Amino acid sequence: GSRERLVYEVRQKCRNIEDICISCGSLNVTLEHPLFVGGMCQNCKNCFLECAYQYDDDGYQSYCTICCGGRRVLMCGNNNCCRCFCVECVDLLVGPGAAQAAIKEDPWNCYMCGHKGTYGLLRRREDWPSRLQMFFAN
């Protein structure tokens, strides 16, 4: 019933990732996450609407790109990207230990910037700019 157990089931192909909210683990998916393959529930849609483009004075987004929270986050080293990712989301959706590899990497291109585009279960949508246009549409 936890987010961690649901993601475990996804890795075991006992469940499709589009059928879970990848930001909180809710089964009450109401849309596809606009940036990565996977679902999004109404709570997280709302958190994204309020939170996703909040910025700190360091020029970076205030919260995690995936969950729109986090207490401690990694910042993208791309001088053209202002995104952050929390350790919890990274080690869950990419895989355990992934966050510490990324923290060590210098400089680090985040999962939205990286050319590989797929990282464990974390798969960037090829059409994320279209999905963002639709998400913020009237």
Binding site: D56, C76, G77, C84
Partner: peptide
């Protein structure tokens, strides 16, 4: 990666 606290 640089890190930061969100709080």
């Amino acid at each position: 990666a640089r890190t930061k606290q969100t709080a």
